[PDB]
Short mmCIF file of C-alpha atoms in Angstrom, two decimals:
data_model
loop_
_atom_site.label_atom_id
_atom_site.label_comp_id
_atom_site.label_asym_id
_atom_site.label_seq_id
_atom_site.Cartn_x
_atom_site.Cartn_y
_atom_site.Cartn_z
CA UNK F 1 9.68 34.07 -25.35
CA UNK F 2 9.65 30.65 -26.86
CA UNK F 3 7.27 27.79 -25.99
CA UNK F 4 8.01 24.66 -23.35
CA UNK F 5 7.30 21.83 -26.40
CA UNK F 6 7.38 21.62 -30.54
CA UNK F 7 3.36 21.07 -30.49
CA UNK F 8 2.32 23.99 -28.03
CA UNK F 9 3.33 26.25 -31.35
CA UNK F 10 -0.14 25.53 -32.29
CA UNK F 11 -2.17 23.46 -30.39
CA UNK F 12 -5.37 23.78 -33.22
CA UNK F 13 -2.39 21.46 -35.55
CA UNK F 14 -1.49 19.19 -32.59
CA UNK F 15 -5.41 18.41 -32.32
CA UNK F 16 -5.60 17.72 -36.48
CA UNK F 17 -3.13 14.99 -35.98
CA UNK F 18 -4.10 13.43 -32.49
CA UNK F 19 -7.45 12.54 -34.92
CA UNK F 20 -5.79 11.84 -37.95
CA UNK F 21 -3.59 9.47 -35.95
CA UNK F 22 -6.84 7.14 -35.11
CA UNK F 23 -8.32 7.16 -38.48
CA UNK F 24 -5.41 5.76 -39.94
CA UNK F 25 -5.03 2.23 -38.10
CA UNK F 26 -6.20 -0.43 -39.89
CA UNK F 27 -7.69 -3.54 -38.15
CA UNK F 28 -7.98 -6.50 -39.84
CA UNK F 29 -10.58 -9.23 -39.82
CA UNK F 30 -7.88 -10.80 -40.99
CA UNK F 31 -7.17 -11.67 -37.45
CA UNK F 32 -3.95 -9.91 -38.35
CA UNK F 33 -1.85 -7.19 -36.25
CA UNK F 34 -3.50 -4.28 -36.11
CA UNK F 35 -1.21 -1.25 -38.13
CA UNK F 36 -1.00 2.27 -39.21
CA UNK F 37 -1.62 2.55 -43.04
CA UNK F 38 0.51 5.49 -44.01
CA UNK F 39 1.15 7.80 -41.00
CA UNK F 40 4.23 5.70 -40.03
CA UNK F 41 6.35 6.78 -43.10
CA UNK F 42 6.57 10.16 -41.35
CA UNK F 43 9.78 11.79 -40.09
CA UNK F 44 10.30 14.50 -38.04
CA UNK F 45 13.49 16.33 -38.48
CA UNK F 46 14.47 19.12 -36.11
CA UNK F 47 15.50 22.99 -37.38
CA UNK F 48 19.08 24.06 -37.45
CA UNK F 49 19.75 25.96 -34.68
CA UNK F 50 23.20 26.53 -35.26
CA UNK F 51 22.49 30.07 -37.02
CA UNK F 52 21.59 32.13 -33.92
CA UNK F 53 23.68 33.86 -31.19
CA UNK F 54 25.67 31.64 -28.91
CA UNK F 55 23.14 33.42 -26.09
CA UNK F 56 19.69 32.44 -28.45
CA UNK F 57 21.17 29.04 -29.84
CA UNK F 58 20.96 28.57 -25.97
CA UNK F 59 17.63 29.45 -24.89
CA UNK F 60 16.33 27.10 -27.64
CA UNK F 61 18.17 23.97 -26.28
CA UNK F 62 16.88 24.28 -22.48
CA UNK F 63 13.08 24.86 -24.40
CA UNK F 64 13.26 21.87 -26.75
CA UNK F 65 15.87 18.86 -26.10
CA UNK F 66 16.76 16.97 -22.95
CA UNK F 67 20.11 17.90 -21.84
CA UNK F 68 20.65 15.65 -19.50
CA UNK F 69 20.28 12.38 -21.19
CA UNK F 70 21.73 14.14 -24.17
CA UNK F 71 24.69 14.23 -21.88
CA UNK F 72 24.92 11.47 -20.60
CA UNK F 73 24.56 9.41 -23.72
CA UNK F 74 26.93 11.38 -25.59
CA UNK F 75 29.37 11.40 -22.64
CA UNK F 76 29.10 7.61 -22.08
CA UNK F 77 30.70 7.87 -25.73
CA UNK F 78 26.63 5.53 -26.65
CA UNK F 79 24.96 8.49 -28.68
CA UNK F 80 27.11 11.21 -31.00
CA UNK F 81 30.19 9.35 -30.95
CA UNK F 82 30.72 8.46 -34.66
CA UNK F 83 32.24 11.35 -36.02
CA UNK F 84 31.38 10.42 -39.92
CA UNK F 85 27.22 10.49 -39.34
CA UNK F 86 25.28 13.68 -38.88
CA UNK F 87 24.74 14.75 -34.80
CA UNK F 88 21.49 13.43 -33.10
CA UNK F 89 19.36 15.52 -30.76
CA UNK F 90 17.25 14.24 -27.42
CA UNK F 91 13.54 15.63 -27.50
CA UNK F 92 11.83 16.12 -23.89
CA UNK F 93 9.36 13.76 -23.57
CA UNK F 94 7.24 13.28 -20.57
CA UNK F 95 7.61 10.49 -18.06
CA UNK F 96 4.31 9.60 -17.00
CA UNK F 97 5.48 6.18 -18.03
CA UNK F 98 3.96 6.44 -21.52
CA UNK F 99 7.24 7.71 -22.37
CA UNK F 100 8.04 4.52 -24.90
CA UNK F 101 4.96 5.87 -26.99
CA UNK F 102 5.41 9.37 -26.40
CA UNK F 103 9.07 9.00 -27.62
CA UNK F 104 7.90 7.13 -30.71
CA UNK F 105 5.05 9.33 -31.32
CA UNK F 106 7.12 12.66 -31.47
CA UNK F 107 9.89 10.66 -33.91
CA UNK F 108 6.98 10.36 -36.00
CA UNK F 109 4.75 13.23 -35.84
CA UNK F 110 5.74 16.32 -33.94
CA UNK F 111 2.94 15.64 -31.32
CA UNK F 112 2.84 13.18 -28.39
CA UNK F 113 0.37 10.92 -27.93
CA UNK F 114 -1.27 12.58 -25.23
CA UNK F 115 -4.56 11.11 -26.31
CA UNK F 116 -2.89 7.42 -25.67
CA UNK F 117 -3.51 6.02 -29.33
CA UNK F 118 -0.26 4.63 -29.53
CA UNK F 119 -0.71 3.08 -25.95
CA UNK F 120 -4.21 2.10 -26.33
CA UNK F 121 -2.67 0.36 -30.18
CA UNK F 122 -0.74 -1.44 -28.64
CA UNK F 123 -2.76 -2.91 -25.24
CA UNK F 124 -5.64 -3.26 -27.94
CA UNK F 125 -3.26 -5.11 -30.52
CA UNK F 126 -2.05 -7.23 -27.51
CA UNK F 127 -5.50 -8.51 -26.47
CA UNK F 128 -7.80 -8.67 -29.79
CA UNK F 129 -4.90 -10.41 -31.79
CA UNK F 130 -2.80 -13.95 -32.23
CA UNK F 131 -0.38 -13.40 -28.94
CA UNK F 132 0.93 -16.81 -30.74
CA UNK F 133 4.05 -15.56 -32.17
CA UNK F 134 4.93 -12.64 -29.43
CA UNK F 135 4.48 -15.05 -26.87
CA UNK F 136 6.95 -17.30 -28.46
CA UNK F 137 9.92 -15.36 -29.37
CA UNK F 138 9.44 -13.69 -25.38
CA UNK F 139 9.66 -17.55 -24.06
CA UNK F 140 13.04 -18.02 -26.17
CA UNK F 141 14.77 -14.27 -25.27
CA UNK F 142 13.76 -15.29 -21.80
CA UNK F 143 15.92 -17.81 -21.95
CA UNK F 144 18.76 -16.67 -23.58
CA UNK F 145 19.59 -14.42 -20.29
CA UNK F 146 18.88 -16.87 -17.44
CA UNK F 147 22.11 -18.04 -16.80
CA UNK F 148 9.30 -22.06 -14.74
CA UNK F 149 6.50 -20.11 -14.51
CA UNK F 150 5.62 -18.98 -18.32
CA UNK F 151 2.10 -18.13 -19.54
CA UNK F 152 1.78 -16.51 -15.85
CA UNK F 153 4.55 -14.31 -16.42
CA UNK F 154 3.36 -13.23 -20.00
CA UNK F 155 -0.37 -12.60 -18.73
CA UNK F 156 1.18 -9.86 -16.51
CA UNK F 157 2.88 -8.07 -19.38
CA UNK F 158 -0.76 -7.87 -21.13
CA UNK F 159 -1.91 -6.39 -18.42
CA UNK F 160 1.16 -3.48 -18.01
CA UNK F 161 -0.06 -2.40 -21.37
CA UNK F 162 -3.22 -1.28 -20.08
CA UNK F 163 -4.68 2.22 -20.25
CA UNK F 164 -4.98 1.96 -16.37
CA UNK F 165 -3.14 2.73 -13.46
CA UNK F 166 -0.09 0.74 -11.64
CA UNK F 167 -1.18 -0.64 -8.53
CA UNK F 168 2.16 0.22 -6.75
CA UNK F 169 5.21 4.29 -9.09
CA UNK F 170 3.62 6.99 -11.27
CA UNK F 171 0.61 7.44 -13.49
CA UNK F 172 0.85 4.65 -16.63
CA UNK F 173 2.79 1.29 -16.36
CA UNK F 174 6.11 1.00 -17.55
CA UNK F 175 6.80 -0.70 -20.64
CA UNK F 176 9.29 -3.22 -21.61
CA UNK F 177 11.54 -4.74 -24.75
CA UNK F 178 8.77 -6.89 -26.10
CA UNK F 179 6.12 -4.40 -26.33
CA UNK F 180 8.63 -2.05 -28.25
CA UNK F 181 9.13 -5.50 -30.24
CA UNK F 182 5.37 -5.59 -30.90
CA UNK F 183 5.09 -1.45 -31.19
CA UNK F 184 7.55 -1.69 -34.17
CA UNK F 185 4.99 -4.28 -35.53
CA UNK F 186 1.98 -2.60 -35.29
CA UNK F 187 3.94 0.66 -37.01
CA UNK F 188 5.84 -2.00 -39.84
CA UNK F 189 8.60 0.17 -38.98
CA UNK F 190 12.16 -0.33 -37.13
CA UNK F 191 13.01 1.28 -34.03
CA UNK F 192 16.74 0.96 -32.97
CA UNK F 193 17.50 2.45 -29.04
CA UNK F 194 20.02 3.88 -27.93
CA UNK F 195 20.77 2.60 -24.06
CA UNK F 196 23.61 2.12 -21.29
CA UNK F 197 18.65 -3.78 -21.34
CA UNK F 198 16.30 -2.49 -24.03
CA UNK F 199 18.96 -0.97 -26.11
CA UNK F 200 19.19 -2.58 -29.69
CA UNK F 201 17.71 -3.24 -32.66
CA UNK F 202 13.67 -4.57 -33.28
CA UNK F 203 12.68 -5.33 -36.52
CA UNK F 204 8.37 -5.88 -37.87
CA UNK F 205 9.32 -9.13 -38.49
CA UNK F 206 5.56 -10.28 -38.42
CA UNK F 207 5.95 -8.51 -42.08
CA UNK F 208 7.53 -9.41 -44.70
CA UNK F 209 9.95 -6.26 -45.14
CA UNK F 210 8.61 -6.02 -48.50
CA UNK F 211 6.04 -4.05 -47.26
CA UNK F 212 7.45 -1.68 -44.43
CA UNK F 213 9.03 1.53 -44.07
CA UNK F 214 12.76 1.06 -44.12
CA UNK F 215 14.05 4.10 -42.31
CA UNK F 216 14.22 3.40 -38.64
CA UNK F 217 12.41 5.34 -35.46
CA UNK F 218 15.65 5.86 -33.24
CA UNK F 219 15.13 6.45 -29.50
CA UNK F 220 17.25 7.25 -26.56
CA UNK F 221 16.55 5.53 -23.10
CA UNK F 222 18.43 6.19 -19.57
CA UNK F 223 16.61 5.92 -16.40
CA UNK F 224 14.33 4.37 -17.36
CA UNK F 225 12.76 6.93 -19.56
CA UNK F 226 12.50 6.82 -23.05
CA UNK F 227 13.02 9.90 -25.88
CA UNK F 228 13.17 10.67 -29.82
CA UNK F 229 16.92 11.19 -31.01
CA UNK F 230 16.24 12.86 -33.85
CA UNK F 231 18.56 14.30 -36.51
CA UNK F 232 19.12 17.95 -37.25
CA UNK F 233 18.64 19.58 -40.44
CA UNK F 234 22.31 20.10 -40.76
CA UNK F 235 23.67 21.36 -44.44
CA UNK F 236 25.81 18.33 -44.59
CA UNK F 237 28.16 16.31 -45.47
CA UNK F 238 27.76 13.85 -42.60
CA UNK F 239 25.85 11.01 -43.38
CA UNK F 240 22.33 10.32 -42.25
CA UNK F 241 22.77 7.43 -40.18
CA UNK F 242 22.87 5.35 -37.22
CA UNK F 243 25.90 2.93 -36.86
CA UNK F 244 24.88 -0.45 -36.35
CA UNK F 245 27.43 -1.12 -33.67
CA UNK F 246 28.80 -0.06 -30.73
CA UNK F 247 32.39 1.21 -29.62
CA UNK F 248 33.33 -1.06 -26.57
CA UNK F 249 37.19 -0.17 -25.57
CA UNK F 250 38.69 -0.50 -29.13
CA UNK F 251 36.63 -3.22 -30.85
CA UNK F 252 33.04 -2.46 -32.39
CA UNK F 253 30.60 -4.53 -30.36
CA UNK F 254 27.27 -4.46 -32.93
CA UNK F 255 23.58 -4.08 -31.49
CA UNK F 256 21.49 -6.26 -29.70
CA UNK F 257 18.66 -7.11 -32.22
CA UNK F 258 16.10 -8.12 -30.29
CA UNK F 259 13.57 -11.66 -29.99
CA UNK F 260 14.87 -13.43 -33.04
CA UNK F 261 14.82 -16.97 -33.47
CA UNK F 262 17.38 -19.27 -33.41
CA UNK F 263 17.69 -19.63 -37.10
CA UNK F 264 17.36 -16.16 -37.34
CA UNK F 265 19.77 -14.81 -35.41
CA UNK F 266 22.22 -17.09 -37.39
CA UNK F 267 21.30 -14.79 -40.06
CA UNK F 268 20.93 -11.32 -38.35
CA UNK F 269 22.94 -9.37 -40.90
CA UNK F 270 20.76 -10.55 -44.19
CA UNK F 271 17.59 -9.32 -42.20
CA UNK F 272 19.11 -5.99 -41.22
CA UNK F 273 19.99 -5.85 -44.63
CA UNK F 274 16.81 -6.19 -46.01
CA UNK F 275 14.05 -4.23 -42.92
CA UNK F 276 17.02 -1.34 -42.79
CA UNK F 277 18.64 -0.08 -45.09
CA UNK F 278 22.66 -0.75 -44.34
CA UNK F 279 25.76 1.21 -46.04
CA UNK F 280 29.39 0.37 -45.03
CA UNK F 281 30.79 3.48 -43.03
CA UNK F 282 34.84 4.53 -42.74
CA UNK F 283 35.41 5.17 -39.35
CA UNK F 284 38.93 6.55 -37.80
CA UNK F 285 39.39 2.95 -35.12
CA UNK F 286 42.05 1.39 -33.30
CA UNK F 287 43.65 4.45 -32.67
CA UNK F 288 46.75 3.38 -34.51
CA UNK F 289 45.73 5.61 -37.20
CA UNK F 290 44.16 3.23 -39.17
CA UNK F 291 40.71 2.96 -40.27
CA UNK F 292 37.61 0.45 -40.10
CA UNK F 293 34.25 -0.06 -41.79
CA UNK F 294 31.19 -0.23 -39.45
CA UNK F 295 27.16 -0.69 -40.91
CA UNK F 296 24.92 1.95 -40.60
CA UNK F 297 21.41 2.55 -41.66
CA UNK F 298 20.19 5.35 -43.74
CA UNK F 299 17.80 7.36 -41.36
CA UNK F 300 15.04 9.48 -43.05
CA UNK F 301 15.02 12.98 -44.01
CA UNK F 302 11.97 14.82 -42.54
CA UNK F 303 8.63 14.59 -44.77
CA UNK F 304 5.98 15.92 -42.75
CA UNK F 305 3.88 17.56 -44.67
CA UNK F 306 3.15 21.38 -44.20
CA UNK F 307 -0.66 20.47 -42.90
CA UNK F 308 0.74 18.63 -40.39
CA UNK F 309 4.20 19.96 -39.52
CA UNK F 310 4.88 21.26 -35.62
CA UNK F 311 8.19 22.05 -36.33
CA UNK F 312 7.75 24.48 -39.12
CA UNK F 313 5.79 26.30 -36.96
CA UNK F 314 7.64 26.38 -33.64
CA UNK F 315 10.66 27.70 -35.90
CA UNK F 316 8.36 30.35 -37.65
CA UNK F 317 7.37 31.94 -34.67
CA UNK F 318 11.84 31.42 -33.44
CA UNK F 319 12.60 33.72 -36.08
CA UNK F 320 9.57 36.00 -35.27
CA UNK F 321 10.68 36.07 -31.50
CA UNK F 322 14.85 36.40 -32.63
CA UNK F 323 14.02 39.45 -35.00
CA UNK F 324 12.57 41.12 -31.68
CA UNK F 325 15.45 39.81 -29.85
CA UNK F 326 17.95 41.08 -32.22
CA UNK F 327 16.79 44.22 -32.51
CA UNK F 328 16.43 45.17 -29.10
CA UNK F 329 17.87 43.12 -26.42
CA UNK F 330 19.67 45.69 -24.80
#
């Protein structure tokens, strides 16, 4: 029937962008953060699935998304609970502990950095470049949460970027909040998560948001594996967004942007502002049939081109497989 993965509906496309991906980093001399040029204003957007027998819409689900942090996030009320926003879908991603960049790297492209790009961008980005800043803002989170031993601490997280292998669990180190921090950097893009200590918001703000993309990457993360939530090509009306907040037992507890500065977090909603792209949202609250406004940011509306499009395939060859399946599966 239908394949395992979006890419694996043509693996000859897959390989054009795992090599388009490369040639489009620029590095500096600059001595500035390494970043992608243009291949970060893409957005995947999944099919619409709801078209198909309640049988076939199945078969699809247990091929393509992750059920089981789909349910949990939605059933711990964190994902698809605002009913105003259109619904957002978990992608299986693998957890060889790349799963941060493989997470990302679907969001973005249909594929999966297999070939480690995003990984390698990132270790690479985090030893050739001005730690300076990174270093910094990771100090002052640090303390935030502590209710001694600093660049010592820091040298190790260098180091669990690497390529290589963990000298203890499975087959790539785990990641943590400040290389998403510094992943969102090197892309000039947002990524907000969607979590049960990483959960929040991380902003590129080593850029002036003048000059990156202002649609965010949104990712889903439970056991400590990490996944795309993207958005499904729904007809409408439902807004494309993600609500900037939270609903904590009847009061909206807003998300945890991550390693700002002092000063900055003083003025957290004039940057979200200005690196998202925020709209006021009604929202049925309180239960006392009233209503409340909550900020959301405009998520993007799929642009992959057709040369580089996994999903217009894998749907291509759905149909194919659902005419056969139609006809004849009796």
């Amino acid at each position: 029937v239908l394949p395992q993965a979006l890419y694996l509906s043509n693996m000859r496309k897959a390989v054009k962008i795992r090599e388009r991906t490369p040639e489009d980093i620029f590095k500096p001399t600059n001595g500035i953060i390494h970043h992608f040029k243009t291949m970060h204003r893409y957005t995947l957007e999944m099919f619409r699935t709801c078209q198909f027998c309640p049988q076939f819409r199945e078969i699809i689900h247990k091929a393509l998304i992750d059920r089981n942090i789909q349910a949990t996030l939605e059933s711990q009320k964190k994902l698809n609970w605002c009913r105003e926003v259109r619904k957002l879908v978990a992608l299986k991603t693998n957890g060889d502990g790349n799963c941060l960049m493989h997470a990302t790297s679907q969001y973005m492209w249909g594929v999966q950095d297999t070939d480690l790009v995003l990984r390698k961008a990132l270790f690479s980005t985090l030893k050739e470049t001005d730690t300076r800043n990174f270093k910094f803002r990771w100090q002052l989170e640090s303390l935030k949460s502590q209710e001694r031993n600093w660049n010592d601490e820091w040298d190790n997280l260098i180091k669990m970027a690497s390529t290589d292998t963990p000298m203890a669990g499975l087959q790539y180190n785990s990641l943590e909040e400040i290389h998403i921090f510094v992943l969102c950097n090197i892309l000039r893009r947002p990524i907000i998560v969607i979590s049960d200590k990483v959960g929040g918001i991380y902003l590129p703000l080593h850029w002036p948001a003048q000059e990156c993309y202002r649609y965010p990457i949104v990712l889903g993360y439970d056991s400590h594996h990490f996944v795309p939530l993207v958005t499904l090509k729904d007809s409408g009306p439902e807004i494309r967004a993600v609500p900037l907040v939270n609903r904590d037992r009847g009061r909206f507890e807003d998300l945890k942007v991550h390693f700002l500065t002092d000063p900055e977090n003083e003025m957290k909603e004039k940057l979200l502002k200005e690196y998202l792209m925020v709209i006021e949202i009604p929202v049925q609250g309180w239960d006392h049939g009233t209503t409340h406004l909550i900020n959301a940011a405009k998520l993007d509306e799929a642009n992959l081109p057709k040369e580089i499009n996994l999903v217009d395939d894998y749907f291509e060859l759905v149909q194919h497989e659902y005419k056969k399946w139609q006809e004849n599966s009796e």
